[PDB]
Amino acid sequence: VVDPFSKKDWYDVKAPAMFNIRNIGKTLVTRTQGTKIASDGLKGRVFEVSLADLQNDEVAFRKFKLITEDVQGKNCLTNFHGMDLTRDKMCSMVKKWQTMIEAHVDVKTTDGYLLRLFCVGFTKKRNNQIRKTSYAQHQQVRQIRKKMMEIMTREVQTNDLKEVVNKLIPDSIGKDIEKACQSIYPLHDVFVRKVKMLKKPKFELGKLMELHG
Amino acid sequence: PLAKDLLHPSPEEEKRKHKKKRLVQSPNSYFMDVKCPGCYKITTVFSHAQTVVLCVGCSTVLCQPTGGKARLTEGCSFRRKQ
Amino acid sequence: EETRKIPVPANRYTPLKENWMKIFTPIVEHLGLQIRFNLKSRNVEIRTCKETKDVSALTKAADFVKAFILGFQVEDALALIRLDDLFLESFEITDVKPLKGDHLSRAIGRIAGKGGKTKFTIENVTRTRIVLADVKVHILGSFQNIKMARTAICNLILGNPPSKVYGNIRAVASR
Amino acid sequence: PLADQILAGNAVRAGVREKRRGEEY
Amino acid sequence: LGPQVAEGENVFGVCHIFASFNDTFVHVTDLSGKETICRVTGGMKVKADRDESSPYAAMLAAQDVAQRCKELGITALHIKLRATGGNRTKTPGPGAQSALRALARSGMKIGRIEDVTPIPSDSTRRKGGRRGRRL
RNA sequence: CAAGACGGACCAGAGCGAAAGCAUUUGCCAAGAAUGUUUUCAUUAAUCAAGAACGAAAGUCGGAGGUUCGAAGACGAUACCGUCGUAGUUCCGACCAUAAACGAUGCCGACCGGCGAUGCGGCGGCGUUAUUCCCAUGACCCGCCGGGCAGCUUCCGGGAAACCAAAGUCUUUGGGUUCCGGGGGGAGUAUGGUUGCAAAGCUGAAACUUAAAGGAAUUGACGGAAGGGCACCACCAGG
């Protein structure tokens, strides 16, 4: 009988300090009428943001989940939650005459963000190869899966999520696995295809200021 | 075609054939004399040896068994015997 | 400036080379967009310019080359360009019945028919177009024509003989 | 072509038919 | 009414276009997806069960949501297509394409296309039997 | 957030297993084919009834769990469809031992074509990569050998033909050995025996009756069907 959108008001949401473009947009939130506060409904909102919307010259087929849990007076404040790949990239990247090798680890970081990695790689046809199919044997698959587990486990664990996120920005882990794993069977498209967030510690406000400015 | 002297095959076809399918069968294996680089002694080793053969004086690893021929250690010298 | 990118598979690369001319000439001449083939990522790139009107054609242009990705001929993709209501409907053969092994290949053969003729007949009946991929089936046409061709295909893979489907699809065409 | 087929199915044929019906000094 | 954003910059939303085989849903939300702006189904545009999944109902739905979001002030939307997913077909139908082209026909700026349908890794038994197809 | 299910894409002219069957990671356990072999025994072999092992799906008894699907069943429309849903589907423990369980094609052996692909093992050889790799080793490239898997083709010969590298080496008829058939019905019927709690399973007629029963490819015809063309001895608009 009466429109709810006149009651609604806008908040502005910014990106963390790892990212060149900080304007990630606006949010439509109800005002507080004494029953429920806008902050409590605004302290848990996940944003599926493309990388090209965060940096001008980066690629677009990597997406980041950023969780907003703080408000600062028409200023939404977010933090990292996860990372994934677009479905079209994942579908076009699985072509036929090759073997896909996929691995996962559960790992603890330096500041309590227990998290999981999923990475995928594909066998690569040589430049002079005349054979149609480039298949790796089972032992090569096990050795490759092992090696990507230790590489991704060591270059996530010893750093912080500032350095983890700035490693995921150009995906240095994937190209490092591609470089160090080419001696068993040469690989084709190595990316960390998914990062989960299994556990979080208690909320702190100073580290959000470090993550933002 | 349809005309070849089966009694007198030229040596490349006899070498090419499987060892049991030769006109008179002969093994592809041989015995070889190996010298360890850390010494001067000579050891007689089968080419397709299945057991690891150690030096009588140096006790070093001479050959490693593989699926076919044995893998001699980098450094050892060998000479085919007879 | 609006931008579209469409991936190309490896088996669609050579037909994209041999039909490139009749792909960019309908786009830049009487539709007016910017075309390129992003060779590193193997994508088709569509951009606007200062010579763009009737912005919806932009989206149409995307679907244009998308049809050529799916296996359709060039002229049918031009039919996406010229007409305003022309759609794509896609489904797998197993999405309607579980068929495994040789039964799936036999279902493919019933859709195609000997010499292709059965499949050919349905286009002349339904003014659609049909792409038979490995397991996928793509149908291009208006909504009622898509429905009619889809029903004909589903009956062809139920197990119904292709002669019965031929006769009944010639009959139902007259409405 | 699918566009040509739809346009021709939606239009009417016309033209060809020759009907034969019907001083200086 | 609307966001306090200058004329040069637009305001982004996202559009859940759920094209089932029986109808088509047009759900517009913000970047979070928690808060709702509009949602117009093929049943609310036609008073007939014939055209519930029609391209025409989706076209009317997209025009309605485009004019209502322009009334509110959202000038640009991201596009997220979805099919029925699961055991059933994974490809969006003609209703989704009709809604997409119709809301792009309104002159409203379009974002990036993401097709996230619930594709199962592996799933349970499908709705039909060992025998039955659609027809 | 939880509950069970299932291991898509990759996934194939593929691989493994006696067959039925087998696809998430990692660890453990005992098997195994092929290859390599100047190891060992020295004829230890082939085929075989009863019996034994495993034997898809469905199904029968105890439990656990019930997410989806779903015989029965209850509704609505019209035997085909939709809503809900029992047994079942899943796991463990005992049964039942049948499939178009197919190559509609006993097993062991000898001789007998072509092409270029593939899987594993072995052998030989220049080169390119491991951010020019500082030797090997992997990944490719070239060639050969041995068993496999599987295409395409063949004046090998065979066949009724479809076809077949065996379904060839067969009236120019004999490598070893097992089961099994003798025109169509009556009929897997009656009876006897045996197994199975049971359902059923193995074995199994005759009187009588009939001139057929059937196999392989090819179109000849064929009420009709879909397109056009002509006509005021057809139609439209009319007189």
Side-chain angles (χ1 to χ4, degrees), chain A, chain B, chain C residues 2-91 93-101 103-175, chain D, chain E:
Chain A
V1 296
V2 62
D3 57 355
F5 282 152
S6 78
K7 181 193 309 215
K8 299 319 189 84
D9 57 354
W10 289 103
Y11 292 78
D12 177 2
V13 58
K14 299 289 94 175
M18 284 74 74
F19 297 99
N20 295 115
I21 291 145
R22 310 207 72 176
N23 213 9
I24 62 170
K26 300 286 209 141
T27 312
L28 187 153
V29 181
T30 177
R31 288 187 228 262
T32 306
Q33 278 74 239
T35 44
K36 52 183 65 147
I37 195 167
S39 300
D40 278 32
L42 193 57
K43 278 180 183 292
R45 291 188 179 181
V46 193
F47 293 98
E48 182 68 27
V49 177
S50 177
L51 173 69
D53 291 331
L54 294 162
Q55 294 197 2
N56 215 21
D57 62 358
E58 270 302 272
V59 304
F61 55 86
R62 213 184 321 265
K63 300 174 294 211
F64 286 90
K65 308 182 184 64
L66 318 177
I67 170 169
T68 291
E69 80 271 25
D70 263 359
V71 70
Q72 289 284 57
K74 207 185 220 291
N75 191 359
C76 283
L77 183 63
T78 179
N79 199 18
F80 178 81
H81 196 232
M83 183 278 288
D84 204 74
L85 288 187
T86 55
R87 192 181 292 275
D88 62 358
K89 173 70 162 179
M90 191 63 219
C91 290
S92 66
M93 183 179 72
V94 188
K95 64 182 292 295
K96 219 192 183 195
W97 312 112
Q98 72 190 5
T99 303
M100 65 179 288
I101 308 154
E102 65 183 1
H104 68 277
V105 292
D106 290 339
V107 65
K108 187 73 169 178
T109 182
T110 44
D111 52 350
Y113 295 148
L114 166 69
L115 61 83
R116 179 172 290 147
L117 280 76
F118 301 94
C119 71
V120 294
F122 297 88
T123 67
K124 190 202 193 195
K125 182 159 173 154
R126 307 302 290 171
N127 49 3
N128 68 325
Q129 168 162 349
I130 71 163
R131 277 156 62 80
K132 172 180 62 145
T133 73
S134 282
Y135 291 142
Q137 278 164 339
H138 190 48
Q139 294 308 302
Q140 279 98 304
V141 166
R142 291 158 47 120
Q143 288 170 48
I144 285 163
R145 184 177 295 114
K146 191 178 197 257
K147 187 159 309 281
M148 45 169 54
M149 293 177 71
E150 292 85 4
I151 297 299
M152 86 180 171
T153 299
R154 292 184 292 113
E155 283 82 5
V156 65
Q157 170 175 264
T158 186
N159 318 284
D160 202 79
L161 273 296
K162 274 80 72 177
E163 281 85 6
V164 166
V165 162
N166 296 115
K167 270 149 182 304
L168 290 180
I169 287 301
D171 194 60
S172 66
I173 302 170
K175 66 182 290 294
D176 186 74
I177 291 172
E178 206 195 349
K179 189 182 146 314
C181 189
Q182 189 274 331
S183 315
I184 317 181
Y185 208 101
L187 289 201
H188 211 173
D189 272 320
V190 176
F191 311 102
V192 192
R193 75 143 176 110
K194 192 165 182 176
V195 186
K196 277 192 182 193
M197 180 49 48
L198 289 167
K199 182 65 177 66
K200 288 174 69 70
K202 297 296 289 183
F203 306 115
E204 273 320 293
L205 194 143
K207 35 177 73 63
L208 274 53
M209 295 298 102
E210 308 282 344
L211 265 296
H212 277 263
Chain B
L2 290 195
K4 192 52 70 199
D5 202 46
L6 313 168
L7 282 164
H8 295 110
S10 68
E12 69 275 16
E13 293 83 3
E14 281 288 325
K15 188 269 183 182
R16 186 244 304 172
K17 277 183 198 178
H18 183 262
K19 64 169 189 189
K20 292 294 279 213
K21 302 198 194 177
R22 307 197 162 117
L23 187 64
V24 174
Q25 58 184 267
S26 53
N28 296 296
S29 56
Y30 53 91
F31 288 89
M32 65 182 179
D33 283 336
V34 296
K35 279 77 70 177
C36 179
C39 194
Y40 77 106
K41 300 180 291 295
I42 297 169
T43 311
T44 290
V45 180
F46 193 56
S47 60
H48 296 64
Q50 311 156 14
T51 187
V52 64
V53 176
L54 294 174
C55 190
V56 295
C58 283
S59 307
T60 60
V61 176
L62 276 70
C63 65
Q64 293 276 3
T66 66
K69 292 180 176 179
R71 183 178 293 171
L72 291 174
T73 302
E74 307 260 29
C76 304
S77 66
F78 64 95
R79 186 273 304 278
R80 203 197 156 105
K81 182 149 59 176
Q82 195 187 12
Chain C
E2 269 317 292
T3 300
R4 299 292 183 184
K5 64 90 176 179
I6 293 170
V8 64
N11 66 322
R12 289 318 271 176
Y13 176 88
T14 300
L16 203 69
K17 299 289 94 176
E18 316 182 355
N19 307 332
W20 186 243
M21 296 299 103
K22 50 186 58 66
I23 277 166
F24 65 94
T25 59
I27 296 176
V28 301
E29 287 313 282
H30 68 95
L31 195 149
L33 293 177
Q34 183 62 255
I35 188 66
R36 80 152 201 277
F37 190 24
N38 196 359
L39 201 70
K40 300 287 99 175
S41 65
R42 288 187 176 179
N43 273 10
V44 174
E45 294 293 328
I46 292 293
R47 288 188 296 272
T48 62
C49 305
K50 62 183 182 293
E51 321 200 327
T52 61
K53 316 150 283 302
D54 219 328
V55 296
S56 296
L58 170 66
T59 301
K60 279 155 54 83
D63 277 5
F64 169 51
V65 71
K66 177 186 183 147
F68 192 58
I69 297 303
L70 288 176
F72 289 95
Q73 305 279 340
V74 184
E75 285 82 72
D76 305 329
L78 272 296
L80 283 73
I81 293 297
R82 294 178 64 88
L83 273 76
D84 203 59
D85 289 328
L86 205 66
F87 300 86
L88 294 174
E89 208 263 335
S90 191
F91 61 94
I93 297 176
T94 64
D95 275 334
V96 297
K97 174 179 177 180
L99 284 186
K100 292 184 288 181
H103 303 279
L104 190 57
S105 70
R106 282 195 281 270
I108 294 160
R110 295 201 291 282
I111 295 184
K114 182 163 314 293
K117 304 175 304 213
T118 297
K119 185 176 78 79
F120 198 89
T121 289
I122 298 183
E123 284 97 9
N124 287 318
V125 175
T126 42
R127 64 179 64 88
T128 50
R129 298 294 159 190
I130 286 153
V131 183
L132 271 166
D134 287 16
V135 184
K136 299 288 305 292
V137 178
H138 315 287
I139 299 167
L140 172 73
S142 179
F143 179 55
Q144 287 70 240
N145 294 114
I146 278 176
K147 270 202 269 181
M148 185 180 288
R150 190 177 88 223
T151 305
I153 281 173
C154 279
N155 285 293
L156 259 177
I157 60 171
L158 295 191
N160 300 121
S163 63
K164 180 210 194 197
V165 181
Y166 188 103
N168 294 115
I169 204 64
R170 297 292 299 274
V172 175
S174 82
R175 285 98 164 103
Chain D
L2 187 64
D4 291 331
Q5 177 145 328
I6 295 184
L7 286 178
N10 294 346
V12 288
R13 53 184 288 205
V16 60
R17 209 184 299 265
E18 322 282 355
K19 221 88 190 183
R20 297 284 75 78
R21 283 176 188 166
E23 273 184 350
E24 289 182 353
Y25 302 104
Chain E
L1 191 145
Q4 282 77 233
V5 178
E7 193 82 6
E9 195 171 3
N10 63 7
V11 184
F12 266 113
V14 76
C15 183
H16 323 271
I17 297 169
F18 172 56
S20 170
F21 63 93
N22 282 333
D23 53 354
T24 288
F25 296 70
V26 182
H27 202 157
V28 175
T29 54
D30 60 336
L31 277 296
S32 66
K34 184 73 65 71
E35 277 273 349
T36 300
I37 297 169
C38 183
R39 176 175 46 142
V40 291
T41 310
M44 293 182 286
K45 299 294 113 182
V46 298
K47 311 297 300 171
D49 203 9
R50 300 304 184 133
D51 291 330
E52 209 183 13
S53 62
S54 66
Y56 187 71
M59 183 278 288
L60 294 174
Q63 296 294 321
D64 189 358
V65 65
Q67 68 181 357
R68 184 178 182 271
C69 294
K70 277 180 270 201
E71 177 212 304
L72 202 173
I74 308 296
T75 301
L77 282 71
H78 288 306
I79 301 299
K80 177 191 82 93
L81 294 175
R82 183 200 162 182
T84 187
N87 289 316
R88 321 281 207 106
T89 61
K90 328 287 180 58
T91 300
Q97 324 175 34
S98 180
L100 182 62
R101 295 193 287 191
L103 61 85
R105 197 156 36 237
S106 69
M108 182 179 72
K109 185 172 169 68
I110 191 167
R112 57 177 83 270
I113 314 299
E114 60 189 2
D115 186 74
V116 293
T117 182
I119 288 182
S121 288
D122 276 319
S123 56
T124 302
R125 203 141 171 82
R126 201 187 69 194
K127 177 71 175 179
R130 216 196 177 212
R131 203 182 35 82
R133 295 198 204 252
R134 279 197 270 280
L135 271 300

